[PDB]
A paper describes a structure:
The newly discovered [name] enzyme (named for [name] adenine methyltransferase A) is another orphan MTase, is present in all [name] genomes sequenced to date (>300), and is active in all [name] genomes subjected to PacBio single-molecule real-time DNA sequencing (which can detect N6-methyladenine—N6mA), but is rarely found in other bacteria. [name]-mediated methylation at CAAAAA (underlining indicates the target A) is required for normal sporulation and biofilm production by [name], a key step in the disease transmission, as well as for colonization in animal models. [name] comprises an N-terminal catalytic domain (residues 1–320) and C-terminal target recognition domain (TRD; residues 320–577). The basic surface of the cleft between the two domains forms the DNA binding site with residues from both domains approaching DNA from opposite directions.
Accordingly, we purified [name]-DNA complexes and grew co-crystals, using a 13-base pair duplex containing a centrally-located A:T and with a 5′-overhang at each end (either an A or T). The complex crystallized in space group P212121, resulting in a structure determined to a resolution of 2.68 Å. In the crystallographic asymmetric unit, there are three [name]-DNA complexes (A, B and C). Thus, the three DNA segments form a pseudo-continuous dsDNA molecule, with two target A residues located on the same strand, while the third target A is located on the opposite strand, in a way representing the presence of methylated CAAAAA on both sense and antisense strands in the genomes of [name] isolates. The first 26 residues are disordered in the current structure. Here we describe the interaction of [name] [name] with its cognate DNA substrate, resulting in a rearranged A5:T6 base pair immediately 5′ to the flipped-out target adenine (A6). The shifted A5:T6 base pair stacks against the 3′ G7:C7 base pair, as if the target A6 was being squeezed out. Intriguingly, in the [name]-DNA cocrystal structure, we did not observe a bound cofactor in the SAM binding pocket next to the active-site, even though exogenous SAH was added during initial complex formation. However, the added SAH had dissociated during subsequent complex purification, probably due to the low binding affinity.
Author numbering: 26 to 131, 137 to 577
Amino acid sequence: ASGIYYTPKIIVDYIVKKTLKNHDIIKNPYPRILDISCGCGNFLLEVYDILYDLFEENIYELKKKYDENYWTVDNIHRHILNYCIYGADIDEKAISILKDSLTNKKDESDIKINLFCCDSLKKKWRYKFDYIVGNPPYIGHKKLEKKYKKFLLEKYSEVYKDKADLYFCFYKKIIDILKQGGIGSVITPRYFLESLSGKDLREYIKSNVNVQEIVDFLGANIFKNIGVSSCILTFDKKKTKETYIDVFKIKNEDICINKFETLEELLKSSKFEHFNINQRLLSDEWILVNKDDETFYNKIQEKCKYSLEDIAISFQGIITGCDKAFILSKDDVKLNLVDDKFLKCWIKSKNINKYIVDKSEYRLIYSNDIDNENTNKRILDEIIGLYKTKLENRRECKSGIRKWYELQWGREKLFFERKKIMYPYKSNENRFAIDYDNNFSSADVYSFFIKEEYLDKFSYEYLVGILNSSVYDKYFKITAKKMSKNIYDYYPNKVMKIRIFRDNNYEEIENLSKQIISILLNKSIDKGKVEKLQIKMDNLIMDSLGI
DNA sequence: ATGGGACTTTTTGA
DNA sequence: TTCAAAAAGTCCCA
């Protein structure tokens, strides 16, 4: 709410060092370092200390090369505050605190400080900057105001579109006002590396700057008590012909960031893996994996001839708009007031397992089948109407498109009331299950059914067998969107792009999947046999894919 | 009190 | 008319 977030000191030190470790202060004693979202100035104070050390270490060389009277130890503070440090923020209080801190670093002429309290995306910047650091704000499409979103769409259409984020626009602004040959280094969410909304931002970054380094923390909790996954991006505008990116990807997401005094020590250690990515070979997606994973992914992609999107029709669950008004326990007495034709089985993401779905515990009132208010007054007055006001605040109800008691997005009943495959929208592993009970679900579970023309080619049992294998788990996680610790996004924009194969092992894989399903559906389950069959199927799939 | 695991709504642009 | 993406997630407990 306040917009002020405490970046860890080690991250700030690493970013400042990355920007300013190889700066020739003799050649250019007037470097412009800008923090576009400084806030309390965690980055700017470190920049001040680094610059003070740099000027003090080379004070006599500057005295020789330039005006000897101007370059004195006493005058370093004034020079840094006048020509070096620039900060911008939207909070007056934080800017005041930062100005006080910069003043207290060292009456006189009341040295001026280049601190601005305004919107960095609206400010007209007179000059470009040698170096840019800081941590931009992260605000999604839900928490962003409508008029500001219109402004972003009009002015930042190159990177902001649909469900994009504000830090996309901040990336664009940082790139735009970066001096030629300058270096920028920021910490942002890692989602733009793989999200669908980030495609335009990725294209802009690829085509406008050379990405020096990507540090991916995956699901590690960099910010305490904050539910976000972070990455560090360092880029330049220098004239270079190599265009190779160092990628440091974390291997253990439970590590403590204070293991060493410096972040580079952590990167060098066994807690991180390093590899190189050719920027010129980047596609719409950024496949930031090592050589072994790249070979694995390429083999799977080249071997497979079909994809899930080609052979299946996919859809999202029902979005009622107020779950408490339409979802009831199956053992609720109020369900006695609702006819069984209006009741549908309701499942959550946790109910989805491998090859099977847990028994339904909830019922959904498909209120779209209620013709009018008069005939079914009991249900509306005693069940749904308890949240009527909230139901009236939905967008479609305010515009009159939807009645107050109707589901906001009821989809089509025929899609759910058939044999299909369901999977949770967020999970730690591949969980694709055949639904035999015509289960309905919210958007936390996605569903798909095979097209008629591909039924003779692919069966549900074979699909769930291959998709739940460790091979396909690893294959999907190569390009999957990492959300948090042990959580990947399983959405149609990437699930439907999974490629599938068909060869001489189809029959045995289908038989093993059928055996696993039969064991799982039995009243008494011996799961060890299921694990053994899964191992056999994994071996068979690896044999099929030549890996 | 914080840290970490189980679990996941509906607002929103298109 | 109506699809689907979006964690500065959210809540609970030791």
